[PDB]
Amino acid sequence: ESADLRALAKHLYDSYIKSFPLTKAKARAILTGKTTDKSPFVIYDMNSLMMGEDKKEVAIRIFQGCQFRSVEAVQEITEYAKSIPGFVNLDLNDQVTLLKYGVHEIIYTMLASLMNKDGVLISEGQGFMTREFLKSLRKPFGDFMEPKFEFAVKFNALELDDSDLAIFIAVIILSGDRPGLLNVKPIEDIQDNLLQALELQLKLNHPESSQLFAKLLQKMTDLRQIVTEHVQLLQVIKKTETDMSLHPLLQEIYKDLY
């Protein structure tokens, strides 16, 4: 019933606010100047970066920074997942599998909130690293960000807000087609409800947005490809750059992933 679907929407929004300190609303505010004097420090070259770091090779320090921020993101996303109704009653191995295979799709969804066509907010909104600087990084590290910019730009053009994103991310986490799931059916029943909630949210929140639900679902597909490509790059780094490694939490996620 539609009142239940709205209660679910609001619960997911409340839980998203409680799980994620940096919301798209706040990110977009920073990106567009609608906060205060504390305008972000712009990192557009190597001097910028040194100047900014104040308040190994450069590519590798950026890599290691993103991995550390990724650990905190996994933790917040896990906390969010535990607030999706039904999730904590799933077999615990299935919870692990949904997070293992879904967390990166969610990471890149939420990273898009921090992005525009020219760069990305870093250091919880205090800095802005330019697209051209990230692109300048040597191979393979210069290949990380660019397809995410390509994704973010088209994704942000749908103009989803935090309330929409909360249900979008829940739908993705509760995907019944992850490898190695023990009980697919209870996952699919939860997802089916989330999807109905998402459909109603998008109709009410974006009534004139043409085929917005369909376009959204399509994005969930595009995220999987973003992640496949990202994981292939991580593999290359592991094979050819082995002078370093991931955090243990990220190692768990990545073990036997694709």
Partner: peptide
């Protein structure tokens, strides 16, 4: 494992 720990913390 660390994932299990995150999932079961209250």
């Amino acid at each position: 494992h660390k994932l299990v720990q995150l999932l079961t913390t209250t």
